[PDB]
Design a protein around this ligand. Structure first.
Ligand code: SF4
Ligand SMILES: [Zn+2]
Ligand SMILES: [Zn+2]
Lengths: 752, 98, 37, 131
């Protein structure tokens, strides 16, 4: 439909609209016109992405400013869904406006997901793909080929073919999804990865993952091209803190240091070889270093630094090199003794946690490395490696980790902690020392984003409570509200089970995971539900290790044999490709009526973007609260930082963290309002978390369902499933849950 | 074949055990029989490969497959793959020439 | 064994002082002893 | 050589109480037992095949870094920094002069480690330390 807001006409791609969607759109328009940030919590059962694109696209096309749109998702799979929705919305606009308006929309990802080279796309690791592409695209091969065509170095026809055409003609006007982008580029022998990255400045709407906005390693290059007044949308940002923390975190093992010494020795040998035959390169690099130039001024835009900047762009020193590491040999010696200090610090026998300042002071004592030269370690290394003609960098790959650690520890001093543990795995015959550099403050990574961009919209299906996010992340919102779906008839039945059929309490506490009563009680619940669940069943476990132990126990007892009679069993595995095949098989089994049960991890790969709308999901069995491993040094340090700084109680955050994941899985079952499913939370500890669940889920949880038994749960589920199989009365939803064009006008009249 | 953990304490049949290594060859041949490009909608491989240079804090032991004192796998993961392979084969068998 | 333990080397034995050496009769002949189950 | 004295080969397995020591003069590993016997009553030549550098017991110390080459550089750095020691404020904030000064100190340390000009450089160290 095509309705009107106060001054903005918006074209909806459907003849109908939910009341929540219109209210959602109105609030978004208010925020954009007033400016500032906002937090909106819309139910998962109502079209959210379509509403966002519809309003935002109209906003950019109507107002004179023509502000661009930045869409941030959490996974690559979500980008595909957003692009597909964008294509459908744009097709509707092109059919109602009578012409294809000037519009460009592209998604972003790594080379591995867009490499068409027949020999480089067959790699199982993204780092290798990047190295091979850089070798064929850095320009060394092109320069060498120009001088002497006899050189055996090869080129990439996809990259080469792009030089023939201009940047504005890489793709035709419109929206190109990854599925469409690869097909178009394959027919013309072009590189999708390079086409997208060279058109970011021309795209009206750009979609990428959070890692491309918060991680300084890859965000800086992409961020440098986007506009400053563009609209920013954070879709499904209920777990943004984890991405923010992981961007400025590092882990060092004994093997990493042992591999670093070999690379350092190889680097010294390479320098000696180059010194004998070709010493002018070192002098030329040295001359520029004396002047005060850096990587940006020396490296060409075509080439990339070997070591990605591990700190935010605003924290990099703009002064010349201190002079200690100005020469190749001096820097190598500086690097070599730095590695030794790390190695001699890995022989500790008890856990030691110290701030970066203490580590720097001890480093300045045992050796004579100052803070300033340490900050330039990553920058200097990228220059030295580039000038060394290092076409093969397998030996030097480990040195990237050491450089990252040096630039991180010497840059930040607040909100960061250094952990050294004598046992990486507590259950190990031989100790395995580990050195972890953990980021405690979650607002450091996102601080530049909230300052560079004026308006930011944070939306997710289960972002609750809304008051904590501003507390955790230092930012302020003009408004923050959550919508409640106005469903005419109950479509989802959320239930909490505290004890089994035998009235014995059931819990997923790790210390009692090997309990014959709890294991059997959970197994009985799984079998009983599988008997009534028609097609699909998703089972989420607190941790993968818990799933392994409990699943093995069920196999010995014989529970699985009974489950196999009704549904096929698919289990999530650490391997990503194997898990993807399981999803394909699980979806195929649910579609053909064979019936399947999927066992996954609440904090796994499935829960972070995979949807189970209609048939692929009809019942959600949350086996226990997905509590994090409390006895973790990294987690314990993080809790202490929040308690002292943000005045957040340790128990409150832990419960909030666990619930934010349990709710996350709950919202991946409802698409629209004709979808239905039963949500059961199997733990005695869920009985008091009703107030912590999302408002649209808590409202559906009755007071009688707060503590149910397995036998009582089955009876209610059978009744609910039978009730939802009846033909819905159209009159019951003509204008109370779904709005036609006429009804929408009426609502705009009464409100006005 | 029943998806049960093999115990080194108890040994079964000498004759049949000779085929244990052959099965390891069939499983690899069956893994390729099932491996094929997957739609980007449910492509979980790309989600982890979205940022090839992502480096944070490695997950705790609760987030990784179980291991023994010696550090090797306890073998419970193998049965999980076995049941996953069995389900995948059953669905594939449906999509035959007929 | 004690001498090795005092000097550091682990002894592969222990002192032998530690070892601790640890009405109706017509039915006769018909009833079997079902003492246990 | 893994855990046994080069001279007496007193392995840690049979002698867990063994403690190793090094001497800055030639950076040669030696257990405490050998040090006392050979140097208790006076200086003596190093008891290594090919080494004839005399050393004293009082100069022995415990190795910090497991790499001998890095140990030599750090000790030389400590010796040089006991004479060549300045700060940024020493040049009134002149970064260009300070950077050149730092490079010169690094160049000296490099020459000492690899013995480029031992005679000339050593005299320079002696000359500067007086003033
Ligand atoms: S230029 Fe594109 S197609 Fe060629 S190797 Fe790089 S990513 Fe692959
Ligand atoms: Zn000795
Ligand atoms: Zn000697």
């Amino acid at each position: 439909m095509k309705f009107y807001i106060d001054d903005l006409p918006v074209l909806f791609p459907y003849p109908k609209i939910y009341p929540e969607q219109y209210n959602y759109m109105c609030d978004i328009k208010k925020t954009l016109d007033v400016g500032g940030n906002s937090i909106l919590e819309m139910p998962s059962g109502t079209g959210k992405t379509v509403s966002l694109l519809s309003l935002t696209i109209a906003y950019q096309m109507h107002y004179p400013e023509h502000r661009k749109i930045i869409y941030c998702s959490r996974t690559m799979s979500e980008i595909e869904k957003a692009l597909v929705e964008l294509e459908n919305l744009m097709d509707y606009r092109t059919k109602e406006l009578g012409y294809q308006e000037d519009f460009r929309g592209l998604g972003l990802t790594s080379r591995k997901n867009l490499c068409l080279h027949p020999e480089v796309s067959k790699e199982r690791k993204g780092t290798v793909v990047d190295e091979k592409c850089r070798r064929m695209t850095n320009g060394q091969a092109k320069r060498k080929l120009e001088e002497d065509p006899e050189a055996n170095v090869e080129l990439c026809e996809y990259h080469e073919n792009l030089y023939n055409i201009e940047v504005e003609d890489y793709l035709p006007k419109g929206v190109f999804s990854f599925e469409k982008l690869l097909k178009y580029c394959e027919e013309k022998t072009l590189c999708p990865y390079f086409i997208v990255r060279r058109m970011i400045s021309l795209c009206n709407i750009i979609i990428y993952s959070y890692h491309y906005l918060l991680d300084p390693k890859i965000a800086e290059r992409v961020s440098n091209e986007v506009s400053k007044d563009s609209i920013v949308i954070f879709d499904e940002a209920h777990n943004i803190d984890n991405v923010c923390i992981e961007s400025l975190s590092l882990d060092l093992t004994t093997d990493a240091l042992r591999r670093a010494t070999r690379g350092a020795n190889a680097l010294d040998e390479r320098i000696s070889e180059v010194r004998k035959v070709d010493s002018q390169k070192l002098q030329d690099e040295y001359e520029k270093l004396v002047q005060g130039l850096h990587s940006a001024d020396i490296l060409t835009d075509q080439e990339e630094p070997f070591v990605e900047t591990p700190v935010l762009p605003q924290d990099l020193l703009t002064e010349a090199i201190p002079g200690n590491i100005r020469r190749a040999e001096h820097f190598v010696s500086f690097l070599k003794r730095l590695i030794e200090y790390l190695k001699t610090r890995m022989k500790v026998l008890h856990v030691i946690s110290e701030t970066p300042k203490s580590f720097l002071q001890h480093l300045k004592q045992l050796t004579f490395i100052e803070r300033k030269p340490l900050r330039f370690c990553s920058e200097r290394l990228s220059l030295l490696v580039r000038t060394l003609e290092v076409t093969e960098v397998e030996d030097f790959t480990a040195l990237k980790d050491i450089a990252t650690f040096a630039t991180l520890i010497s840059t930040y001093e607040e909100g960061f902690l250094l952990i050294i543990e004598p046992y990486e795995i507590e259950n190990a015959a031989v100790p395995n020392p580990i050195m972890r550099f953990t980021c405690l403050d979650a607002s450091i990574a996102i601080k530049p984003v909230f300052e560079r961009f004026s308006s930011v919209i944070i939306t997710s299906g289960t972002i609750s409570p809304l008051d904590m996010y501003p507390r955790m992340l230092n930012f302020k919102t003009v408004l923050q509200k959550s919508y409640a779906m106005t469903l005419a008839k109950k479509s989802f039945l959320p239930m909490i089970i505290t004890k089994g059929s035998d009235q014995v309490a059931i819990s997923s506490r790790f210390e009692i995971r090997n309990d014959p009563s709890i294991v059997r009680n959970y197994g009985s619940m799984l079998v009983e539900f599988a008997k009534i669940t028609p097609d699909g069943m998703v089972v989420f476990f607190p941790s993968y290790l818990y799933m392994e132990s409990i699943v093995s126990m069920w196999q010995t007892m014989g529970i699985l044999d009974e489950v196999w009679k009704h549904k096929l069993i698919l289990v999530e595995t650490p391997d990503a490709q194997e898990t993807s095949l399981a999803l394909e098989t699980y979806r195929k089994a649910c579609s053909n009526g064979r019936g399947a049960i999927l066992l996954s991890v609440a904090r796994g790969k499935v829960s972070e973007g995979i949807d189970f709308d209609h048939q692929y999901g009809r019942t959600v069995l949350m086996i226990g609260i997905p509590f994090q491993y409390t006895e973790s040094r990294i987690l314990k340090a993080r809790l202490e930082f929040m308690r002292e700084n943000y005045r957040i109680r340790e128990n409150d955050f832990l419960s909030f963290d666990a619930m934010r994941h349990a709710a996350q899985c709950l919202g991946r079952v409802l698409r629209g309002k004709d979808d239905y499913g039963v949500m059961v939370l199997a733990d005695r500890r869920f009985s008091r978390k009703r107030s912590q669940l999302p408002k649209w889920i808590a409202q559906g949880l009755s007071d009688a369902d707060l503590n149910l038994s397995t036998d009582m749960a089955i009876s209610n589920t059978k009744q609910f499933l039978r009730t939802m199989a009846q033909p819905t009365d159209p009159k019951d939803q003509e204008g109370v849950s779904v709005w036609s064009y006429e009804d929408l006008i009426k609502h705009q009249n009464s409100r006005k | 074949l029943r998806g049960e953990k093999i115990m080194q304490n108890d040994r079964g049949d000498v004759i049949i055990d000779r085929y244990l290594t052959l099965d390891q060859e069939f499983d690899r041949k069956d893994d390729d029989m099932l491996l094929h490009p997957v739609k980007k909608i449910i492509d979980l491989d790309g989600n982890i490969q979205d940022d090839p240079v992502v480096r944070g804090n490695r997950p705790d032991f609760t987030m990784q497959p179980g291991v023994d004192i010696n550090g090797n796998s306890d073998g419970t993961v193998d049965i999980l793959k076995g049941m996953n392979r069995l389900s995948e084969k059953m669905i594939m068998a449906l999509k035959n020439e007929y | 064994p004690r001498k090795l333990q005092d000097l550091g080397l682990k002894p592969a034995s222990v002192d032998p002082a530690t070892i601790k050496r640890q009405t109706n009769t017509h039915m006769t002949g018909i009833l079997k002893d079902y003492s246990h189950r | 050589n893994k855990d046994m004295c080069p001279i007496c080969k007193t392995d840690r397995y049979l002698s867990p109480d063994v403690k190793f020591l090094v001497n800055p003069e030639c950076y040669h590993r030696i257990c405490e037992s050998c040090v006392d016997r050979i140097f208790s009553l006076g200086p003596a030549q190093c008891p290594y095949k090919g080494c004839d550098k005399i050393l004293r017991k009082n100069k022995f110390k415990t190795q910090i870094f497991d790499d001998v080459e890095v140990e030599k550089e750090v000790d030389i750095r400590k010796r040089v920094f006991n004479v060549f020691n300045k700060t940024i404020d020493d040049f009134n904030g002149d970064l260009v002069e300070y950077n050149k000064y730092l490079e010169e100190v690094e160049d000296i340390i490099y020459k000492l480690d690899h013995g480029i000009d031992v005679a000339k450089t050593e005299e320079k160290l002696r000359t500067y330390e007086e003033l």
